[model samples]
Target: DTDDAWRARIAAHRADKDEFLATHDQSPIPPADRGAFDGLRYFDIDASFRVAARYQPARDPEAVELETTRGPPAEYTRAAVLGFDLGDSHHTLTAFRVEGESSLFVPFTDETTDDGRTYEHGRYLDVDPAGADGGDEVALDFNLAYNPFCAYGGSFSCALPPADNHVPAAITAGERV
Candidate 1:
């Protein structure tokens, strides 16, 4: 079945990531911890977390400053708006880019954040608009959401999720600590 395939695919992806984090020299996990590192924790892979969102490209991307966890604010240009349905209401998140970068960076915080569940600073997702045009449907998979490098090491200065990107409902998918 399709669901089975998707589950297997995610499982393989996680397995690969574990391998990297546990062995790679450049891994976010500190070298001292790699000796006992098992793997990253995650929520169950539920298909419902994957939503089909309508992409609304901005006519002129606006520059915005996103506060960071440890360093000065990071600058990004708002490139698009992704509208999708989740929980009991409709929601929209602004997609941003770092100086005309091709991919869209969506950093967000949900109800689960700071509840001793997900990462306290929030999570991030990347969406690639390779062949899509304006007003096209794109997949916004919350199940693929992940913590920033700062979550692993305090030395990293990661961009904090903007207030506009906060979700009212709990998004119980993706990485969790």
Candidate 2:
């Protein structure tokens, strides 16, 4: 029953995607537009689904617990086993690491051999890792999975996904250009 709701939500999400693209294309541009035109081609309209995931919180309670107590700890790594839909099937987006006080950065891409179905440049999910559980599961709704900051502009330097986290399936549930 819950999965059905998720499917419906994703369908509605696609509709919203269509609307955004229509609106964005028609919006007026400032006269200063020049090299800025390159950015618009990558504009995407879909969002991400947040699904619950199971994870094994690393040891070193001193760091994990300290961050948990005083907001969020530093110098510790947090991993999550996330799920995403690929057409009628669902697959996992495994792994992430804690970088700062409030960010659990996940860099990933999909199985588009030529790097077209997914963002060739890669996408990321920067979330607050504090709420995820050691075994309690983390919520991974696609609406929250978004394009990397680099998608909007070329100035941001985002962390790349580690080798262990890469998946070989097409993750069609989140933002796609």
Candidate 3:
């Protein structure tokens, strides 16, 4: 039963990634590039990568502009910090939200970036509104971490993770480049 569940989750995630590359109209991949596109690489599924984190909300959440890899800095609200523990240390990551949205955006880079094993710009994990606005505990599933659109090779643009959001672990649980 356990294996069945895990296999199902992995298959669904893989299918979603495949569908985006093969059929999504606004996919980051260039039309000609899809043929050469080998499927995305992902870290082995690890249940440990999913954790319960405490969310600390910003008191004011004032609007701020963050520089992107593309053109102008986009407007975002630095709304919260997610505090959690991994390995032998505790860490914190800043979570943001666009102007009027309520979902929590966690974009981060890890030690995986050191060897260019993943996107150099980092990956993202979005917390649904329920998790972002909850009491305290929020689910963070690193298995869902994905590269920024720009990772596919620059036909599209994306926001690079802010420096403060770096997590100091060799997170081997996400899309691998």
- Give the number of the best model, judged by lDDT: 1
* Model 1 lDDT tens row, 64-129: 899997868999988888999986699999899877578799999998995769998899999876
Question: Taking the tens digit of each residue's C-alpha lDDT, what string does model 3 give over 50-169?
Answer: 777887888788787767887888778887878888877888988888756667788899999877988888898887544434566677778889888888885665777888888889
Whole-model lDDT for model 2 versus the true structure? 0.50
The stretch of ten residues in a row with the least summed lDDT in candidate 3 is: 128-137
Sort by lDDT, best first: what order?
1, 3, 2
Residue pairs with colliding backbones in model 3 are: none
- For residues 1-177, what per-residue lDDT tens digits would candidate 2 score against the true structure? 576676677567656654553446442333244325433232232334345554435454333211211233334354555555544565665454555446556666656414685566566665455453335455554444456544543344445554445556645556655
- Candidate 3: residue 160 Cα off by (Å): 1.3
2 or 3, greater by lDDT? 3
Instruction: Compute the lDDT of residue 22 as modeled in candidate 2.
Output: 41
- Best candidate per TM-score, number? 1
Ranked by TM-score from best down, the candidates are 1, 3, 2
- Total backbone collisions, model 3: 0
